[PDB]
Amino acid sequence: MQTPHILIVEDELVTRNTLKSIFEAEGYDVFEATDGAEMHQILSEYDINLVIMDINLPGKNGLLLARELREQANVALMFLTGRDNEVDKILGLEIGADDYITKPFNPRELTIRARNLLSRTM
Amino acid sequence: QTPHILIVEDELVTRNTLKSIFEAEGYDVFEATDGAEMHQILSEYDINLVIMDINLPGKNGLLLARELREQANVALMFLTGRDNEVDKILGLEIGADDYITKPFNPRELTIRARNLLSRTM
Ligand code: BF4
Ligand code: BEF
Numbered sequence: 488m489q490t491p492h493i494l495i496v497e498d499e500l501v502t503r504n505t506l507k508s509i510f511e512a513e514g515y516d517v518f519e520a521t522d523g524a525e526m527h528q529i530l531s532e533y534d535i536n537l538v539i540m541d542i543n544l545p546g547k548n549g550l551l552l553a554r555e556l557r558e559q560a561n562v563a564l565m566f567l568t569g570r571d572n573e574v575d576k577i578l579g580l581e582i583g584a585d586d587y588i589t590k591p592f593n594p595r596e597l598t599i600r601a602r603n604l605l606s607r608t609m
Numbered sequence: 610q611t612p613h614i615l616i617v618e619d620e621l622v623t624r625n626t627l628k629s630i631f632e633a634e635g636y637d638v639f640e641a642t643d644g645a646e647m648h649q650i651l652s653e654y655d656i657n658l659v660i661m662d663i664n665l666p667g668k669n670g671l672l673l674a675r676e677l678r679e680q681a682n683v684a685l686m687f688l689t690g691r692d693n694e695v696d697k698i699l700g701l702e703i704g705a706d707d708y709i710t711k712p713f714n715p716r717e718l719t720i721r722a723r724n725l726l727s728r729t730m
């Protein structure tokens with residue numbers, strides 16, 4: 488029924504372009520932030536159903552951005568990050584992300600996890 | 610309410626370990642080795658999360674998950690030695706909320722279960 492709105496918080500242009508075309512190929516509207524200030528402004532200004540969080544960002548890192556997000560909102564959240572190590576994965580989940588996916592990733596896996604998560608939260 | 614976990618797993622050392630992992634979380638743990646036992650526990654008790662192994666005696670867990678999904682939206686995670694991209698993608702497509710491979714980090718497992726239960730309960 489409702490058109491899903493996805494926010495990708497991701498500092499690399501090429502990765503954003505890829506994520507955008509993957510999610511548009513799902514019928515979603517894609518909002519883009521390169522950092523924490525752009526993220527907060529999109530979140531205060533537009534309906535957002537799912538946040539995809541990179542960790543290595545200019546300014547605050549994705550984990551802390553996630554922590555702040557979780558004090559305001561219970562919006563669906565998934566990390567998508569090149570931080571492919573057990574500690575960051577566990578922290579990201581502990582902080583309250585619904586999922587944690589490493590780059591490089593299978594795009595089908597990303598979109599099916601997003602879809603099941605959205606079905607559960609929208 | 611205290612969470613009720615149904616673990617469907619036919620290897621008893623694995624299952625005993627899951628049972629103790631989840632009891633250490635304060636959860637009530639129900640156990641099944643196959644689909645007949647799983648369906649009986651689902652009719653008799655209130656189950657908040659199903660942890661589903663794939664290689665089972667009788668019907669495989671992907672098929673049991675598919676049947677389950679036609680009857681119920683219950684929280685579901687695969688936990689399985691099928692560490693391949695095809696089965697992962699299939700399990701998610703069938704509607705599992707997560708898919709976790711053995712060997713597993715028990716902390717990853719309890720935290721993912723906790724977050725999922727926070728959504729569904
Ligand atoms: F529209 Be969907 F994302 F709920 F399937
Ligand atoms: F820069 Be992200 F954490 F991959």
Ligand code: BEF
Pocket residue numbers: 662663664665688689690691711
């Ligand atoms: F037998 Be299970 F799929 F590890």
Ligand code: BEF
Pocket residue numbers: 603606607681682683704
């Ligand atoms: F993911 Be659906 F709500 F079973």
Ligand SMILES: [Mg+2]
Pocket residue numbers: 497498499541542543544
């Ligand atoms: Mg980055």
Ligand SMILES: [Mg+2]
Pocket residue numbers: 618619620662663664665
């Ligand atoms: Mg088995």
